Write a protein that binds this ligand. Sequence first.
Ligand SMILES: Nc1ncnc2c1ncn2[C@@H]1O[C@H](COP(=O)(O)OP(=O)(O)O)[C@@H](O)[C@H]1O
Ligand SMILES: Nc1ncnc2c1ncn2[C@@H]1O[C@H](COP(=O)(O)OP(=O)(O)O)[C@@H](O)[C@H]1O
Ligand SMILES: [Mg+2]
Ligand SMILES: [Mg+2]
Lengths: 242, 57, 371, 371
Amino acid sequence: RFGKFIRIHFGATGKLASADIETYLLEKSRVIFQLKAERDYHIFYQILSNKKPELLDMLLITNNPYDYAFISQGETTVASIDDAEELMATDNAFDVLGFTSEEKNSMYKLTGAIMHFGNMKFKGGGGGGGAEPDGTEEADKSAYLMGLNSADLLKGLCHPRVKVGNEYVTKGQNVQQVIYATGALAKAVYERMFNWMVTRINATLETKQPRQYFIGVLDIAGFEIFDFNSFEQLCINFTNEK
Amino acid sequence: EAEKAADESERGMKVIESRAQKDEEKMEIQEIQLKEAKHIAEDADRKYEEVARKLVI
Amino acid sequence: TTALVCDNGSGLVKAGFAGDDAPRAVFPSIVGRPRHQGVMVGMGQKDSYVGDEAQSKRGILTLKYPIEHGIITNWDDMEKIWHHTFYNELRVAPEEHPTLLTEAPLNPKANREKMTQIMFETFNVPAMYVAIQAVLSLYASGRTTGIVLDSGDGVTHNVPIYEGYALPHAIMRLDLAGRDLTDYLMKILTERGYSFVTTAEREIVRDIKEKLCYVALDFENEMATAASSSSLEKSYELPDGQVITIGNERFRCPETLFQPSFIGMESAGIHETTYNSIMKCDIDIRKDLYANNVLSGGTTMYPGIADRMQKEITALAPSTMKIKIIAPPERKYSVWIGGSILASLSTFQQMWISKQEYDEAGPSIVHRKCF
Amino acid sequence: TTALVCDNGSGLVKAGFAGDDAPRAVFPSIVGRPRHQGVMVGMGQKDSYVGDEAQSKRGILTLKYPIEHGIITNWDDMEKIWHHTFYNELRVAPEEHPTLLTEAPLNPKANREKMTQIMFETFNVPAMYVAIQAVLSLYASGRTTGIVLDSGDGVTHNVPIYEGYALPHAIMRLDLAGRDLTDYLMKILTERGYSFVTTAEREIVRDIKEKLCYVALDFENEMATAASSSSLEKSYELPDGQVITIGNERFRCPETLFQPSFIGMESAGIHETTYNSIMKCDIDIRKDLYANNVLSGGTTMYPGIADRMQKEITALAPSTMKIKIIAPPERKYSVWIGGSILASLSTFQQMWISKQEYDEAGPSIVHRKCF
Ligand SMILES: Nc1ncnc2c1ncn2[C@@H]1O[C@H](COP(=O)(O)OP(=O)(O)O)[C@@H](O)[C@H]1O
Ligand SMILES: Nc1ncnc2c1ncn2[C@@H]1O[C@H](COP(=O)(O)OP(=O)(O)O)[C@@H](O)[C@H]1O
Ligand SMILES: [Mg+2]
Ligand SMILES: [Mg+2]
């Protein structure tokens, strides 16, 4: 989906110097909303691989994909590629990379946290328009995961603070608005994770040679056509048309 | 004492809002049975009206 | 380019860019002049202090409000206010920013005509538009129906909107507002021993009203409780000392809204005007208006006002209707949020009154379909 | 292929594919226009709400019926109704579907000609046919003789048919119908203190008429009982509360059918018109016509109407003649059922008016012997 791009730089004397990598047009809608016959990103399915029980037990991840809301909406699984050895190879590649394993644990736990935002539930107040949470075990475990406070997070989601003039005021949020806010937060955090990963990879690949004129290489998704075209397909087609 | 009163307020609001959702459910179900009672009442009413007209004719 | 949303309001000017979640600049709409002589030579005091700065020098200035009830009464002061807002607060040139202005219903046409003339000539704004407070308040509330009660510092008005269609014959206006409440608080504080006369102390009384006053669910019961118990008395710190303790006067000032007869007004309370407005509209939309009652404006920020209003309306309305009152926490800035949303709409870009149209049709162009 | 059976009627359009047990789409025949201006921008309100949607927006719309008494007076509105019926309620393109229409006896020829022209031109239906609303009702009753009384919302008529042979000289038409009853109910409800003027609340008054009104077996006795006792009063809940109680007016509204003089019409009552029609025929078929009275149309759904009609006709008719009145529960949709039955007949497939025939011979085909 994402528009991978690689600029291969050269030296002053027309000799290979180093390479730079950038990403563009990463789609966030796939994270939350998936078509009926399509899957989500391979990350979540790979994480649910049972060959590593340590991650599942330390993240308190439910081994059943059906229970979770974000993934069960789309197709649960297909015989596309065996996720076990692919995940193992990705972990090995990260291990032989420049950064340590604490960071890998960080990405894994953050992905798990992204996974649990779907368990949030909210009930409209009986006497007020604003809606408050009903269950908090999922919120409690998630806040523990990020090292945040469950009460503070619930207050922020329910009662966002906004700056007006020179003073702070609280805003009211209903169930639909808080659900949209949670989805937007998940999409934004995933996008920031991907961008930070790309920057780290670029920094690791970077060598100390001078950067003269470069040669670009651009890979983009094609003009995909379905019988059930939707917003994501519209964006892809518009980019291809441009 | 301000903090003690804050704790008093918090568990008081918790208990009263639990009672509030309980009473909301109660009033909803009683309103449903109210509708059902009204429908059966009017059903019997006009059924008897029609049969009484049949009887008199 | 980007649109600019400014709300003159009354007693508080609030301005910002369109598409923002809250106005950037909020400050009192006050113009102050020095009343003393001035002995030090070389400091060179300016002859007019405008905006929040006048609050700092409140003790040596005669504060004047350019507007009494919506209507502008001192045009030069309004020009100074607008200049300060555009230059010293937002630090932007209005030469390249369309301006959306907010104006209350049922006002003299000359007011809008002069406003547009000043905007187009003095500041040369490329385009401008004028909107009604009620519509913006409904926009900010995420609603398309219901009756909105906007009660600011100048005037309190009720407007019913159903499915985006207004009911002009049912729009109601009442001149009772926050300023009258402050004046009544001054009049009722003197019976305890505290006298406030100077315009500088107007602000102190207003601050006391904001910080301590509250609306009573029942008047007689609260008065009886205060006649014996002393648990309703609260102390306030003046800017020099001599704390003052107020008892039943705290919940008697806001009762004027429901009991205008206190200050001699013939009209009825807001709770009754809302019901009358609802019964003015057609019979087929009264249920939705009852179920979608909206509040806006600073004066509606008193604690317990929503419950009292709901109780009164339920007493007036038939027992078979569910009366629901919507009181978002951000009542004061609802109008500006609605204005920002309106200005951010794409289909609104063709409704601006361009400079060419004003030049061709003169200042009266405001009263065409571009209402 | 399949045939569409559209029954425009008046005040209720009902349509559905031929061969179905019951009509698929039933909705009021009204066109609503917004009588206000609209303040909220970006909603993009349509300029005309048609069909059942107009019933949900009664409070901000003015409603007009395109059919006054059987005939069509506003052709644009009727075209809108037909388009909505074809493209929204049924969601079937009329390009490949013959249509069967129904209309009352003794109507202007221009009405039928223009209907045919519009249907062939605007919608380009492959073929269409027109029928009398009475013969279809007779079909739906599984009969072949007797008289049929079709009391709809616009017009009432009596059509005697014996052994499948219609008798044109004995067909009777009266303009009193449900709409006049609704108007009379609005007029007489004023004496109790309730005022209904707006067209929107005419629908409310129609709802009360449907729910509470009933036909009295005897008039003077019921008046005496109502004046003496109060057991006949019933209460109805308006859309905005204030339940209202109606007593003597309960059975006065439907009596206008037997007492036209209440509304000033000189014509005789329904029973007298039926009796006169019965004798307007020959003498050898009067017994069967007496024994095969058929009722159809919504207006004939009043409780106890059948008994009163039977009593009146028995009083008028000779004692030695058996009188029976057929009142199936589905009077309202009898006409559409009969039309569906007729369209499903194999022999009727040759009676359609082909588009080529209309083009060759012109709009006057329907009136010519190729009926
Ligand atoms: N928390 C509060 N409690 C009581 N009154 C308040 C409060 N906040 C503001 N007000 C009153 O609201 C007024 C401000 O109204 P405002 O919203 O500026 O009206 P406008 O929009 O017409 O300018 C002030 O005069 C003040 O007395
Ligand atoms: N149960 C009922 N009681 C009283 N009036 C009724 C009842 N049912 C239908 N009507 C009246 O019949 C009218 C509908 O007539 P309808 O059969 O639709 O005529 P058309 O076939 O010409 O449209 C409505 O105006 C309604 O007032
Ligand atoms: Mg205001
Ligand atoms: Mg009919």
